[PDB]
Amino acid sequence: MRGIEITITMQSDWHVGTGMGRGELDSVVQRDGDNLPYIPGKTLTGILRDSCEQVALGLDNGQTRGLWHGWINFIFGDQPALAQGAIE
């Protein structure tokens, strides 16, 4: 399937993605193959996931695990690196 997009309109000056700096800069933003700034899809997934986690956490009445947190693990997948013990 194809056809969906996320449109991001940056409404203030923005910084993303890198723990490195250039000659006069101690923090340099991330740049695509065109050397142009871009929002990496892992940053965008992580940001959008977090905001869905907020919505689900509200719909769950603040429960950290529940029905709507299940839906987040449905849409964005489980995070097995967090869970510990015998997750079956």
Next chain:
RNA sequence: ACUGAAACUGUAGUAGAACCAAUCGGGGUCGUCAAUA
């Protein structure tokens, strides 16, 4: 003889402290100008 999955390069941090747009100056006062006959 079969693509690992999942993971925000992020968190804290006042481009700021110091620095006189300032120093000196009577709104004043006299003989010049031209060259010949």
